[PDB]
Amino acid sequence: MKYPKQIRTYCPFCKRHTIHKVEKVKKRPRSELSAGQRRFRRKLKGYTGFPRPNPAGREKPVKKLDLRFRCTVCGKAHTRGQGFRVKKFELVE
Amino acid sequence: GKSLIQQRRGKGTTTFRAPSHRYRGAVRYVPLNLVQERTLRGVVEEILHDPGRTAPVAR
RNA sequence: AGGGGGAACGCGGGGAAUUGAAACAUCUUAGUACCCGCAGGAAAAGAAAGCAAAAGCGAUGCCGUUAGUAGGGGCGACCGAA
RNA sequence: GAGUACCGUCGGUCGGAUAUCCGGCGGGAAGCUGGGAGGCAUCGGCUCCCAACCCUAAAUACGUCCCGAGACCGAUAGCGAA
RNA sequence: CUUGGAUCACGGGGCAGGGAGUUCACCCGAGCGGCGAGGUUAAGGGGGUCAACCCCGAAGCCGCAGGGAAACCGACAGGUCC
RNA sequence: GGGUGAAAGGCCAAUCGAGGCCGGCGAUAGCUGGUUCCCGCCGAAUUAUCCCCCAGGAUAGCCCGGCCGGAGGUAGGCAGUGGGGUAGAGCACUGAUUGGGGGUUUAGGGGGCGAAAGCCUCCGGCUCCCUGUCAAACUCCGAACCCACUGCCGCCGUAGAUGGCCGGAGUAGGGGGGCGGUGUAAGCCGUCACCCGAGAGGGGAACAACCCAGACCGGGGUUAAGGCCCCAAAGUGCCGGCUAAGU
RNA sequence: CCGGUAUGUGAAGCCCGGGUACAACCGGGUGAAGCACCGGUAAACGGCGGGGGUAACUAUAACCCUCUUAAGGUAGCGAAAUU
RNA sequence: CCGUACGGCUAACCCGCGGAAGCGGGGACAGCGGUAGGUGGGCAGUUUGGCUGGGGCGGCACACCCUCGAAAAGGUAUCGAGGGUGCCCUAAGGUCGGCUCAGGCGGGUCAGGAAUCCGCCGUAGAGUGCAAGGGCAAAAGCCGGCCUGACUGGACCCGUAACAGAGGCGGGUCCAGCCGCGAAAGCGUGGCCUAGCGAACCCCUGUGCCUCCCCGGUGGGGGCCAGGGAUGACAGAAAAGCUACCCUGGGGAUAACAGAGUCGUCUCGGGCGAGAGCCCAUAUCGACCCCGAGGCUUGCUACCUCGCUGUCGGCUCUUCCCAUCCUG
Ligand SMILES: [Zn+2]
């Protein structure tokens, strides 16, 4: 499924229609400084049975996209609707 | 589970222990600190069967 | 000089499982039952290298509230002060 | 008032959460021109204090004993045992 | 018990005595009673004819203003009609 | 959870696929058994969604008690405004299905005069007309019936309905009879909501639900279902006809 | 199961760099045993392949085409305490 | 500077012989303490689902969409009948304009000819992103042009789940903002309608604000809003077996067996008459179709019985039926 690189859309910040470039969100791993990971590590220490649920290889074959639309005029990004599921995603110009 | 014979032997019970009160004493030479440079002489006076040894001993 | 004895109350260590979570492993049961050591008519604590916050208090211990609160926790069941 | 205060790591424990206390291992001070605390770390202010040595009554807990009392039982009851 | 028991479904020789919705903490409601924009004392203290009786004691708790995660902001003690 | 075992899971004080005693311990169970006086007023349910749920539970539905509020409501009928594709019927769509009488001949292997797929025909395809048959997943048609609403008739209601708030439950194995689908059938699964369950009495020989009929107490009468030769209260009843097989 | 080479990977720790007035943190390298790779071992656990055609007549096929694996049941016994 | 590898030494430590002094051997290794990784049923704790004409294997119609069943409003179940989805599309989305399809016939080049050319007829037989059913003709279909309403902030309704309660999911009617097509009226919050997916806790990204224990800075942490990452047993545990050495609590709600029901199957019959029998339907044999009896053969069902007795066969002993082998 093809999708354009450029879209003219409403910008919440400029409060008018502007041009927006399309980008996929690129993930990153868990931070050690987060309270939840602090708690998990605090539960993993010492003499214990494993303390939490652990699903091995749980995944959907077709996921939704997470897209951000970045304005040229102002430089800020925003979300536009909910995601849809598709296997092939190709940004055409 | 239950135990093996090789694990029960380590406990040191009568079923497994050697009956060495039946034997003739241990066999050792003479200490250096009493045969330093003397070249001691002895006479053989008896040859005996020993139950714990597999070899005959001499007195 | 010591050794042994003493219901309950006292000080210091070692430390489960049943059970609940409508299964179960973190948790709970529980610093419980039970084990070891040590004292007395009471024991332990005790005279701020503290509590507080624009004001101040003034050693320890006990009673009533603070409060099922702050907070902990498969943030679940439940636990829980000053 | 030194293997002490303090740092890092491991185990236990706590409501103590990046901020409870205990212990082990590796490091390790200043010391009166000095030192500590203020719920993540650190810098600067302000406030409060002087650890690593010792003793200490009263207010509190208990009742193998004694004393008194009772909308308690009244011999299959009441302590197992009148 | 069971859709269904005189059943070849279960329990059922006779008599006398014994024998099963209790207590506490928290929450929701009610029937009555006291005070009333306020209501109520706890621990404790004082007196007495000494576990009964009389007086003191509002610390605290609920209510009198809410909304909001939080910083924060902060209302009709009566204008019209059926 | 140790011993001992020429190995059988054999033996360790009548106890062993982990001894015995006391303790934790009044362990826990959605499973089994039990739960103590009288009379009156009301009076059910076994069906939907969710749960490692299916012998258990929660949210609703069906019962009871109390309060608020203040005039309409509704289990029946009549006439109307609208809705609906079942029974039946039929072939106008979709798809099945007999035979004839003709026209185009061929989409196509068979041969024939086939000098060759040939001008031309034979078993066959296309379009008609007459004859004969069908439909749980077809309709040119189309009921009885059911549903909502309006107005009236009837019934309930200021001795307070319909309705709303608060509180206390039980019920999550149903059955007979009638209807439908499935199945050789018995049965299984649903549906209606008259009965049994939770319902005495009178009848069918006895019978949970077939017929009559819904029950405070003491008396007197008339009828119901059914019955009147004897058992057994009441007819060896009346008129017309049939049966000779104890039918 | 044993042995051998390291070429990889490989935790803490150590080192380099960034980041932080210090840390927490982030990215690289090194990094043993083990895993991987090369080999030995069956009186170690265990395994030991069908359709096909053919002779002097009806037969059966020494044997020949054959179709795949680490290898393709040898000597013996055989309706067996195994049919 | 610090290292690694190796070589040696002895004085720590270890071993032996000895009252001990020492002696000899090893040697900064080992052992001891602390930490990090691997292997590890040697030893423990647990799990090992459900529906189900018993259970097991089988099968996942274990979450969803359409037609029938389904009884002309609504609602309605079975391991009931027939089929599909767990996607795809920057166009197959929005809008404006213009046009009309399948097939048949008659005309021409062509072997079946796929198709291109001309005319007429032609209520949709076509086509529609996708199943089935519904809908649609100056269109909802074909051919083109410009676009991105497949958006931001909010409200009230319906369905899943009638009546009659629901988290999450889906759909509808609108108010504002900023925009598109269009002369304009108007339409546009994805796909002509009905399938195409998912809690708490935790994490990642975007965005601007609130906040961290006496006050003020810096790094870092917590909170509110929006999007995303998954649980198909699809209102969501992280999870393999044996018991014939077996134990407890229960159950005829549930199998084996006797009984009870039923009779497809079985056994025993019958009607008609294809005919066979030198010829002749029925001395004898009787096809194919159609009608029955019995419950002593096996199955089906699950009403009775889960500590009634659970046993097959044989020996012994009594009695009954006829559907008669012998005897009249
Ligand atoms: Zn912008």
Is the Cβ atom of B11 within 7 Å of strand F at any atom?
yes
Q: Which residues contact A88 (CB under 8 A, 6 or more apart)?
A: A1
Q: Which residues contact B29 (CB under 8 A, 6 or more apart)?
A: none
The whole-number Å distance from B50's CA to H135's C1' is 115
SS (H, E, C) B2-56: CCCHHHHHCCCCCCCCCCHHHCCCCCCCCCHHHHCCCCCCCCCCCEECCCCCCCC
Query: Rounded to whole angstroms, how far apart are CA atoms A17 and A35?
Result: 40
Sign of CA dihedral B2, B8, B51, B56: positive
What resolution in angstrom units was achieved for this structure?
A: 2.5
**What residue has token string 């987060």?**
A34
Q: What is the DSSP letter of A34?
A: S
Q: What is the DSSP string of A49-80?
A: ---S---SS---SSPBP-EEEEETTT--EE--
Give the nucleotide with minimal C1' distance to the Cα of A48.
C26
Query: Rounded to whole angstroms, how far apart are CA atoms A17 and A8?
Result: 6
Q: What is the DSSP letter of A35?
A: H
Which residues lie across from A68 on neighbouring strands?
A: A23
Q: How many CA atoms lie within 13 A of B9 on its CB side?
A: 5
Is the Cβ atom of B2 within 7 Å of strand F at any atom?
yes
Method: cryo-EM
Residues 3-32 of A with CB under 7 A from strand H: 3-4, 7-10, 12-13, 15-17, 25, 27-31
Residues 20-39 of A with CB under 7 A from strand G: 31-33
